[PDB]
Structure formats: structure tokens, C-alpha cells
Amino acid sequence: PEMVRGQVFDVGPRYTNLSYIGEGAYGMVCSAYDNVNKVRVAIKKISPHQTYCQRTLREIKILLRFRHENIIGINDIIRAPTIEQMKDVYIVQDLMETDLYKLLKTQHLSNDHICYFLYQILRGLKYIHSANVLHRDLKPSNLLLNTTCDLKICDFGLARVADPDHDHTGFLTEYVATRWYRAPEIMLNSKGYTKSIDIWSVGCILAEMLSNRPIFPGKHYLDQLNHILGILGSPSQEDLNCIINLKARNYLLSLPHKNKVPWNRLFPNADSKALDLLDKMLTFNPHKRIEVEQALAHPYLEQYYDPSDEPIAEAPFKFLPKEKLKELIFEETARFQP
Ligand SMILES: *CCC(=O)N1CCc2ncsc2C1
Numbered sequence: 001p002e003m004v005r006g007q008v009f010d011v012g013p014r015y016t017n018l019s020y021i022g023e024g025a026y027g028m029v030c031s032a033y034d035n036v037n038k039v040r041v042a043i044k045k046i047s048p049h050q051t052y053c054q055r056t057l058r059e060i061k062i063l064l065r066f067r068h069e070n071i072i073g074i075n076d077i078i079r080a081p082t083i084e085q086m087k088d089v090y091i092v093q094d095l096m097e098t099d100l101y102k103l104l105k106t107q108h109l110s111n112d113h114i115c116y117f118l119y120q121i122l123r124g125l126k127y128i129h130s131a132n133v134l135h136r137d138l139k140p141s142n143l144l145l146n147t148t149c150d151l152k153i154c155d156f157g158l159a160r161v162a163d164p165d166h167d168h169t170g171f172l173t174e175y176v177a178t179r180w181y182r183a184p185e186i187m188l189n190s191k192g193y194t195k196s197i198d199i200w201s202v203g204c205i206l207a208e209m210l211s212n213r214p215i216f217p218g219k220h221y222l223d224q225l226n227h228i229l230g231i232l233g234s235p236s237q238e239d240l241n242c243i244i245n246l247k248a249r250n251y252l253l254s255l256p257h258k259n260k261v262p263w264n265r266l267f268p269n270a271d272s273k274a275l276d277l278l279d280k281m282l283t284f285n286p287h288k289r290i291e292v293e294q295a296l297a298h299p300y301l302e303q304y305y306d307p308s309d310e311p312i313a314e315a316p317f318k319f320l321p322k323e324k325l326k327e328l329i330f331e332e333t334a335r336f337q338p
Pocket of ligand 1: 016021022029042094095096098142155
């Protein structure tokens with residue numbers, strides 16, 4: 001087997017000429033030459049705890065069901081022919097030159113790039129939400145870009161089926177998804193089980209594309225809320241009345257009055273239509289927040305908007321001892337075997 005940086009990367013004879021790319025949320029990622037389709041591909045190595053493991057299965061199930069131009073696919077999965085011999089699992093995907101995280105650390109985006117990227121994010125998000133799925137970890141590093149700026153959403157490890165009727169929780173409930181992109185309600189009364197959680201993340205990503213800086217870089221759980229309130233200002237009486245939980249309500253009532261920071265003062269170079277859409281995505285009250293199809297229909301995206309070319313999923317998506325999780329991964333990866 002081939003080796004990469006003192007660790008095995010055993011992708012059989014189909015995939016050769018490995019180059020290290022880095023570490024992702026899963027482990028070693030390389031590119032390799034696919035000797036069958038005659039293109040370089042990306043391969044990630046998954047090695048066996050049960051949260052790392054449950055997120056692997058969740059992602060494989062979703063990505064294998066989804067078919068969309070703005071969502072990364074799975075091209076192949078390499079594993080041993082039996083459960084007994086199964087150890088590492090290699091997931092093969094289209095090679096993408098870069099991602100929005102890397103691009104934003106180094107590159108100023110034209111308004112035309114911001115507009116196009118935002119369109120493709122929302123176009124992909126429409127399909128995800130049409131399948132009754134929430135991504136729940138949208139952020140620049142999960143937005144892949146190729147050399148011609150085609151964009152693909154990746155990393156469905158934290159994804160869930162939408163469940164608004166079970167979205168309520170207490171104040172300060174722990175949350176898994178990346179902190180800077182968390183909607184204010186996660187810190188107050190939400191388990192992140194509604195589509196509005198992803199729109200907030202997209203709003204954060206838009207703002208970040210406008211300035212190359214994260215808009216709400218919280219250093220810890222409650223500091224994230226105070227970054228949000230520092231820009232949106234204090235919530236209105238009506239938006240507070242929507243929060244029935246008393247600990248959450250009373251926390252917000254305890255804070256001094258904070259003025260709204262106008263969007264055009266934070267983003268003096270931004271297109272005015274971009275800022276009107278940003279405001280609607282970064283709405284405090286999740287019931288008032290714009291939905292993906294409305295966002296697509298916003299004047300900012302008029303050059304691209306075409307609902308007949310923004311496909312949806314054919315059906316809503318449909319859903320543990322450690323031995324059972326291994327067997328399910330084996331079963332879910334069976335189609336790539338001889
Ligand atoms: C979320 C990251 C992902 O799915 N990727 C697959 C395509 C790809 N190309 C280069 S690095 C990478 C990771």
C-alpha cells in the first residue's frame with residue numbers, strides 16, 4: 001500500500017500519485033489520480049469513537065441520496081470486502097481546487113463573485129431543505145470551489161431531518177455546530193431543528209464575503225450572542241414576547257440597550273441589494289427570517305434566479321450499539337464493491 005506522511009493511505013491500484021492536501025473534520029485528505037475516469041479526485045480517510053462514527057454514516061446516507069450540482073457527491077468508497085477485515089473507509093469525491101475559507105483568507109471578492117457564490121449556496125440549500133434536511137454546519141470551509149468558481153456544499157456530518165415541533169429547549173443548551181455561524185436562538189431556546197438555522201449561517205457567510213472577516217467571531221458560547229446583539233441591537237418587545245422561556249427572556253431583558261449598527265456602516269463598499277438581503281437573512285426572530293426560496297427570488301440575485309433551474313429532491317429524506325453502526329456503514333457502502 002501507498003504511505004503518506006508516516007501513515008497508511010491504502011486506496012488500491014485504482015488510485016495512485018497521491019499528494020497530501022491536509023486534515024479535514026475526518027482525518028487525512030489526499031488527491032490521487034483515478035486511473036478509470038482519468039482525472040484527479042479527492043480521497044478522505046475515515047478510521048474507527050461513536051460520534052465520529054455516527055456522523056460518517058449520516059454523511060454517507062445523505063450524500064448518496066442527494067444528486068445536485070451544488071452539493072458534493074460520493075464517487076466511490078473503498079473498504080475491505082468483509083466486516084471482519086473492515087478498518088479504514090476511503091471516500092472518493094470530485095477534486096475541488098479550494099474552498100471559501102481558504103479563498104477569503106487571501107482574496108478580495110468582486111461583487112460579481114459574491115453574487116454568484118451566494119446564488120449557488122442558496123441553490124444547493126433549496127435542494128437540501130426540499131429534502132426536509134438541515135445542514136446545520138454551513139461555514140466557508142464547507143463550501144468547495146473549483147478553478148471556475150463552481151461551488152459545492154460539503155460535510156453533512158451534523159445534518160438532521162427538520163423537526164420544528166421539537167425545536168424548543170432551555171436557555172444555554174449546549175450545541176455542536178461551529179460557533180461563529182450559530183443563530184441567536186441556539187443560545188436562547190432552539191435545538192437547531194428548523195430551516196431558519198441554515199439561513200442564519202448563510203447570512204453570516206454573506207457578511208464574511210463582503211469584508212473577508214467573520215461578522216460575529218464569538219470566543220465562547222454566550223459571547224456569540226453578545227456579538228450578534230452588538231450589531232443587530234436589542235430585540236424588540238414583540239421579538240422578546242416570542243421567547244416564552246423565562247431564563248432566556250430575562251437574560252435579554254437584563255442587558256443594556258444596544259443600538260443597531262447600520263449595515264452600510266459595517267459594509268460601506270457593499271451593493272445595496274446585497275445588504276437588503278443580508279438584513280433579511282440576519283433577522284433576530286427566526287419566524288421573521290427569510291426562507292431559501294425567498295432569498296433566491298430577492299432582487300440581488302435577479303441575474304441568476306430561475307426556479308425551473310433550481311431543482312428539488314424527489315422525496316423527503318428518511319433517517320445505536322457500536323457493532324450495529326459498523327454493520328450499517330458496511331451495508332451503506334456495499335454498492336461500490338465488486
Ligand atoms: C467538506 C470537504 C469535502 O467534502 N471535500 C471533498 C472534495 C475536496 N477536494 C479537495 S479537498 C476536498 C474535501
